[PDB]
């Protein structure tokens, strides 16, 4: 007997270099029990507590002249207040000292439990899609699990 | 168990050399309701949604470049191919510590094999119990 | 189905668990969650550490979930935030066969670095 628990696990489209497009129409990606993926956002089918999680992986070849700041943020767009409200956020400075060139890898993980309402849209965005590494699978993803 | 939900929680062997070997015959480790541990891989007993998870803890003394990887893979029985479900790559560089937790929900089939590997077993840390583990929970 | 999801009390200089929190179907909060019936449980948690700059003494941040049936680590991790403000969360989660009456604790070593202002500081169990 399958679970009736709203769950989703969507992955970065590896073809869309220079963008962060979430896919459920990809191997080992899913939407279950009412969760929808609409306009790059997960739509919550019913109210309740949910675990929200996401990982992005950033990669760079050395350290450039201008300082790099990498951000990943998970936003909620409620039906009654249709503006992005941050739930989870994290910032990283991959290069402490600039190159006076070794590849660096910086994962950003976000996860937490939030009360969500029916129709809430969830966004998961980065500031630098040009640094995102999603060629190999399993590195960039975004999911929910209803408690 | 009375729930009958296939579950597993396996732990790393601290005295395994140059490898990340999983064990179920340890305290606070288990294989229940059909899940098997065969060739260092977890074997799924039935089709369904599963929470799949793993934690590794790396540790180094100072900074000498080092790349750390941690990957959960799936070998689907119909396909016979090994693909990453969850993967992290980190460049860590006094002692430094790097925990890596990989978790998510996946549709799995009967007979799928799941693996949890790393590139640097020599950087693993086993100072305390509960620092290196791998598991699944059927929804 | 015995379930529990407690949050931290923002209680100073400590990690006190309290009841978006919920306690139900036998799971009591005696500072440990007490297991009402023998079975399989997913036990999870997250803590969030934060600081400004790096001190002279090397700081190691730990978060551990223990089982008391003796005190044994079930889930544990360590973070070294200093090899500018910083934030370091620690996530734990796994499935465990527990006995009726067992106690489960979720502790940190450095509550002075805990962030008391989020959906990232919690401790919970779900009977499967
Ligand atoms: C449906 C099922 C199997 O009963 C179930 N119920 C609840 C959860 C649950 N897991 C949590 C959590 C809050 C939760 F309610 N907070 C954490 N976890 C674990 C570890 N860690 C922190 C993570 O960040 C994480 C990242 C992906 C995946 C699981 C985790 C997971 N699975």
Word description of this protein:
Three copies of one chain form a homotrimer. With 147 residues, the first copy, chain A, is an all-beta fold. Chain A has one domain. Chain A contains no helices and eleven strands. Chain A has strands spanning 7-12, 22-23, 30-32, 36-38, 41-43, 48-61, 70-78, 81-92, 103-116, 121-126, 141-146. In chain A, the strands form two sheets. In chain A, strands 1, 2, 3, 6, 9 and 11 form a six-stranded antiparallel beta sheet that branches. A five-stranded antiparallel beta sheet of chain A has the order 4-5-10-7-8, with no helix packed on it. The first copy, chain A, is elongated and about 55 Å long. Chain A starts with 6 loop residues before the first strand and ends with a strand. Chains in contact: A-B, A-C, B-C. Bound molecules: the ligand CC(C)(O)c1ncc(-c2nc3c(cc2F)nc2n3[C@@H]3CN(C2)C(=O)c2ccccc23)cn1. The ligand CC(C)(O)c1ncc(-c2nc3c(cc2F)nc2n3[C@@H]3CN(C2)C(=O)c2ccccc23)cn1 sits between chains A (5, 51, 53, 111, 113, 145, 147) and B (51, 53, 101, 103-104, 137, 139).
């Amino acid at each position: 007997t399958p679970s009736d628990k709203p769950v989703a696990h969507v992955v970065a489209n590896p073809q869309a270099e220079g963008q962060l497009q979430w896919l459920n129409r990809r191997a080992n990606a899913l939407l279950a029990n009412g969760v929808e993926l609409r306009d790059n956002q997960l739509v919550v089918p019913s109210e309740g507590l949910y675990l929200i999680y996401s990982q992005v992986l950033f990669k760079g070849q050395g350290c450039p002249s201008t300082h790099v700041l990498l951000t990943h943020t998970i936003s909620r767009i409620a039906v009654s207040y249709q503006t992005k409200v941050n739930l989870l956020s994290a910032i990283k400075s991959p290069c402490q000292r600039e190159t006076p060139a070794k590849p660096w890898y910086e994962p950003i993980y976000l996860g937490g439990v939030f009360q969500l309402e029916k129709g809430d849209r969830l966004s998961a965005e980065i500031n630098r899609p040009d640094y995102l590494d999603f060629a190999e699978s399993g590195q960039v993803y975004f999911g929910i699990i209803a408690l």
